[PDB]
Amino acid sequence: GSHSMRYFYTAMSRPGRGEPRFIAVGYVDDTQFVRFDSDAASPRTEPRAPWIEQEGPEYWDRNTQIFKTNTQTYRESLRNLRGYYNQSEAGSHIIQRMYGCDLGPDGRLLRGHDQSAYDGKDYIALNEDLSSWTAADTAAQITQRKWEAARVAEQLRAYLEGLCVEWLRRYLENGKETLQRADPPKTHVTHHPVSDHEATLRCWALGFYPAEITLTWQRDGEDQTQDTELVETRPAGDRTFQKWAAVVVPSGEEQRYTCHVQHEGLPKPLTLRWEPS
């Protein structure tokens, strides 16, 4: 809710090229901080955020080991799945997993998360109560049967409610200046004429954090929601994000159009307009 930590696992089989590749990335809100690529020079976890750098070599070593094990556990899983679906040992297949804990104002866990997928489609998901499972197709039921007999559900609940939250709180503190300080968007309206009667008003928002932002065009107070062209929030490349909303206006009516910016890094929602230079 207030914050959250997530990991993204990706295990793919490389028939004819090599062993199943396993990659894992770690996130705390909209910030990545770690990476493990079993197909690297020396399989070891690497930092992707300044605040995780302060961790001892011990941390990296343990992570590397956990991943070196998980990398192997997945090798089997990949094979087992080809089995279930009767797939041949000549095509690629991908097992993707995403788990994490949502921190709530109560300090403790607000919601546990564990979603697993196969070849892009849903396979199995741990239910909200951190005890049940939801199988997509029959094959998932086979795995469900195992994971229940293996009491994985119990172990995961323990992890999310505890160690997950504990480590998350730590990360938020360690990178407090970033993970806990919102970066408001730098905006401006660009205007380029398409003809001698129409021009494009493009409302810009750059360098903000988190990615959650909303910006829309209006005229006289009435929304242009249907006429607004939006781009998906793309990463600027330095941990902050970019996004823009464009709309075509009749040369003359410009000033009736206003852009409205909403982002938690803004004490009050911005209301922009184009200004001739």
């Binding site: 941390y59 992570n63 094990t69 998980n70 994985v152 480590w167």
Partner: peptide, 9 residues
């Protein structure tokens, strides 16, 4: 810190 996955699918 990621948990140790010891059970396959």
């Amino acid at each position: 810190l990621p948990p140790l996955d010891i059970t396959p699918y």
